[PDB]
Structure 1
Amino acid sequence: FEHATTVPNVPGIPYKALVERAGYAPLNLEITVVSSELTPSTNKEYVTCKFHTVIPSPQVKCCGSLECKASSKADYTCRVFGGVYPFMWGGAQCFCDSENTQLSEAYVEFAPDCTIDHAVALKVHTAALKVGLRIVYGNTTAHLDTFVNGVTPGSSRDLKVIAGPISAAFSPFDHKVVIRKGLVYNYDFPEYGAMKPGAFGDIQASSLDATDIVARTDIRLLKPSVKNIHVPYTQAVSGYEMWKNNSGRPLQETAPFGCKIEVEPLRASNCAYGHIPISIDIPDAAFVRSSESPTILEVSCTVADCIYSADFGGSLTLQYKADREGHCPVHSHSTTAVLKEATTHVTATGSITLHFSTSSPQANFIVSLCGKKTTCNAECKPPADHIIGEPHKVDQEFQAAVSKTSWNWLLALFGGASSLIAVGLIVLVCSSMLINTRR
């Protein structure tokens, strides 16, 4: 037999539901998302890092021409200059007094440290949320992992868990991101081949070991304007490093919904957003016939003092009368309240005390024991502590957040107003009747 329920997409929170297998005694079902793994689809665009300018040893044909031929190196920008008459440490270094042409060369490659200091830009799209589930139900507990696409069954043991799609489409990563040393930054990096001199993407390649390097750096070579041989040149400050100095802060401190961003592969861990549809086929052998389980003839709810808060600040008690001892399930059918306990070893007769949490000051919810239903009605107070170390175990509905008394006052004031317009209609009728009754 299969069951299905929506589940709040919040990590660590144990969601709880009751499966009402018809003639079988109900069974508790706590759905607990151990962790979430929103994996974006990604492709490497290019590797980049601090370009290491390489100016190869100059070439000189002291009495003739030199070709300014092309080469495949990144931003290969060689130029030829005459009258160089360069001096080396040993002295003059050319055949001719005047017609000495000199070839100056410059290109760039990844610095040696780039093997670690590099960053990779990646386009990312259509992120799919993976999740780790731990399911506990009756005397049985199981753990599972599933891609929440609404199609794949991440089945394990006997649980035919199927999950998704996500109630809201979301990704923390924008379609352009850059990964560095495990950090990541959303950044509209320039496209492959779009190297801009002095900005991120100054030098680019498909792999850091690759010779297929393309770059733009505004490298320009000046005349050897000194007697000592030299190759004076200038260029834009490594755009990669310039970016680093002003990169903005990473997504680990910018991703919403508290999702902790992680790399290798780039993925978002523990995201908390929307809700997860869940369906679970369970082997009927996990349930029991209603005659085998105990069942309660009579039950009533008396709520103790309670606090509406993220934690189990509420406490309630139930008197019960049962046919026999055994583990009855206990659950709240109302969405605005969840019980801490999920099972009770019911006696033939007695009472149980249960802890619960609620977001509505009106503790107005229907508790169930062994499938029987009991209404609870109490006024919870606000907690004395403004901030606590635990997320709210339940959402809130504004229609449910109005207190029984505040709701009565509102409906009494609008009732008054509506009674005055009703009196209006009454008198507007009777004013016609005054004429028509004695015409």
Structure 2
Amino acid sequence: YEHVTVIPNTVGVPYKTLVNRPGYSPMVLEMELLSVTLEPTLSLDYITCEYKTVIPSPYVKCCGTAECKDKNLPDYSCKVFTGVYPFMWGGAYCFCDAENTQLSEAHVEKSESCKTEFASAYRAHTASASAKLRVLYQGNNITVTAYANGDHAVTVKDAKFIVGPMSSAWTPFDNKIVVYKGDVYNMDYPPFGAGRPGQFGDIQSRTPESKDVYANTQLVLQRPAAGTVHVPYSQAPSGFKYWLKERGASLQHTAPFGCQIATNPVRAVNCAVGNMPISIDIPEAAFTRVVDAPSLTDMSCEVPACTHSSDFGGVAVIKYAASKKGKCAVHSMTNAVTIREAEIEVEGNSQLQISFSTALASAEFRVQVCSTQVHCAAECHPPKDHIVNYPASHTTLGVQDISATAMSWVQKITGGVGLVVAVAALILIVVLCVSFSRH
């Protein structure tokens, strides 16, 4: 038997579905999503980390002129200053003050710390959505794991479970993301080789181990203080350090739909978006013929109390006369009222007790047991508390149709006005008829 249903992607919420196979006893299955994971495919663009500035000892040449050659280092500069007359602790650097020049050079290299402290810039594509599903089958708890793409079906206890495709392609991750550790951010990082000083990406490499390094630190060599050999320079501070201090909130705290964010690998967890189609192949062994199933008569329902607390605050008791001892399946005939129990046991002449949850101020519903439906209704009271730490077990009350009972005031007023119109209409019609006939 092929059974196809659709449930909301909300995690931690059970759903009840009815299996209808004519000639057999109705069966009720319970399904709950325990975890939903959206794992995006990533492609690394580049690594951003801290840089170090390397300054070799300056070459001081007096009574002559110093010179240098261009280098192919990631960010290199060389300059010669004239009129320099440096001193050492023991006196003047050299004999003559004539034609004195100082040769200064500097370059940028990636820090050794980039091995462990870095941010990775990734491009994101699509996600291989998958989920962990709990199913209550013939009273047994079966847990299955599968991809939410309508494929890679898994069979457990001879039941074949197919999940997806997802009703939504929503993801908290945009096309460009940056990962530092456990924190993922949505950021429009610059193109490789197009980094700017004082900003994220000022120093870049394709991989942590790569010798191919791009840098733009705007390093400028400056003239040394007179009497000294120090090499002054103007350089922008690392954009990595600035970014770390100005990161702001990560997606773990800012993402919509209550998404949980985790790394290694990067993934979105338990996003409350859309719904998930589920298809189950049910073995014939799970179906009992109506001739073999028990049958119930003389059924009636009463409600000791009802509170719409959003946590099964309603209770109902159903009296029954059973033809024989056995089990039956219980299902609500309305979407306004959810019944906690999937199945009950019946024996002889007795009563069963079930709990229910509804948004209704006035509960009016039918309960289906083994093909012997009973109408049940009662007034429900509001909760005393305002706030809870759990989601409602029931669904919404959103129709004008579900206004409470003792609404006859609406019918009486509407009927009263409608009657006035009907009478006035008759009076005019009669006069028009008389006027028409007269000439």
Q: State if a TM-score over 0.5 links the two structures.
A: yes
Shift of the 173–401 alpha-carbon distance from structure 1 to 2, 3 Å rule, reads: farther
Name the CA distance, whole Å, in 1 between partners of 2:96 and 2:137: 93
Contact in 2 for aligned 1:296/1:320 (Cα 8 Å): yes
Helix, strand or coil at the partner of 2:311: strand
Aligned twin of 1:247: 247
Whichever of the two has the greater Rg, that structure is: 2
Q: How does 1:29-428 map to 2 (within 5 A)?
A: 29-49=29-49, 51-58=50-57, 60=59, 62=61, 63-64=64-65, 66-73=67-74, 76-83=75-82, 92=93, 97-98=98-99, 100-112=101-113, 114-399=114-399, 402-405=402-405, 408-410=408-410, 412-416=412-416, 418-419=418-419, 422=422, 425-428=425-428
- CA distance in 2 between partners of 1:93 and 1:286 (Å): 102
The verdict on how the C-alpha distance between 1:305 and 1:70 changes in structure 2, with shifts beyond 3 A counting, is same
Query: Could you tell me which amino acid in structure 2 is paired with residue 282 of structure 1?
Result: I
> One-letter code of the match for 2:109?
V
Q: For residues 401 and 226 of structure 1, what CA distance do their matches in structure 2 show? A: 91
1:270 shift after superposition: 2.1
Contact 1:58 1:102 in 2 (8 A): no
In structure 1, C-alpha distance between the alignment counterparts of 2:340 and 2:424, rounded to whole Å: 53
Residues 224 and 313 of structure 1: CA distance in aligned 2, closer, same or farther (over 3 Å): same
Aligned to 2:17: 17
Deviation at 1:390, TM superposition (A): 1.5
For 2:387, what is the secondary structure of its paired residue?
coil
Aligned partners of 1:172 and 1:362: how far apart in 2? Answer: 40
Query: What is the one-letter code of the residue matched to 1:146?
Result: A
CA distance 1:427–1:59, shift in 2 (3 Å): farther
| 1:407 Cα deviation from its structure 2 partner | 5.5
1:294-344 per-residue CA deviation (whole Å, 9 max, x = no partner) reads 232342332331122321111111111222111211122322222111121
Deviation at 1:30, TM superposition (A): 0.7
Whole-angstrom CA distance in 1 between matches of 2:245 and 2:228: 36
- CA deviations on 1:88-141 (whole Å, 9 max, x unpaired) are 6676279984253513112131351x4343222223233343210111111333
Q: 1:59 to 1:391 in 2, by over 3 A?
A: same
Instruction: Give 1:251 shift.
Output: 1.7
SS at match of 2:433: helix
> Residues 147 and 420 (structure 1 numbering): CA distance in 2 closer, same or farther, change over 3 Å?
farther
Q: Percent identity?
A: 36
- Contact 2:366/2:374 (8 A) holds in 1: yes
Distance 1:289 1:147 in 2: 34
Q: Distance in 1 between matches of 2:345 and 2:107?
A: 82
5+ long unaligned stretches in structure 1: none
Contact 2:360 2:404 in 1 (8 A): no
One-letter identity of the residue aligned with 1:92: Y
Residue identity opposite 2:338 in structure 1: V
* CA shift digits 1:128-175 (9 cap, x unpaired): 432101111113331111222234424444232222233333212233
Q: 1:92 to 1:132 in 2, by over 3 A?
A: same
* CA spacing shift, 1:126–1:428, aligned 2, 3 Å: farther
Separation in structure 1 between the aligned mates of residue 287 and residue 94 of structure 2, nearest angstrom: 96
CA separation in 1, counterparts of 2:112 and 2:412? 77
> Closer, same or farther in 2 for the Cα pair 1:419/1:88, shift >3 Å?
farther
Deviation per residue, 1:231-273 (Å, 9 max, x gap): 2122222222212222221122211222221111111122222
Rounded Cα–Cα distance in structure 1 between residues aligned with 2:145 and 2:205 = 37
The answer to which of 85-94 and 253-262 deviates more is: 85-94
The letter of the residue matching 1:55 is V
- The TM-score normalised by the length of structure 1 is 0.89
CA 1:365–1:119: 2 relative to 1, 3 Å? farther
User: Does structure 2 retain, via aligned residues, the 8 Å contact 1:360–1:396?
Assistant: no
Code of the aligned partner of 1:104: E
- Tell me if structure 2 keeps the 8 A contact 1:362–1:401: no
Please state how far the C-alpha of 1:219 moved relative to its aligned partner: 2.4
Please identify, of 197-206 and 428-437, the stretch whose mean Cα deviation from structure 2 is larger.
Answer: 428-437
Q: Is the 8 A contact 2:362 2:405 kept in 1?
A: no
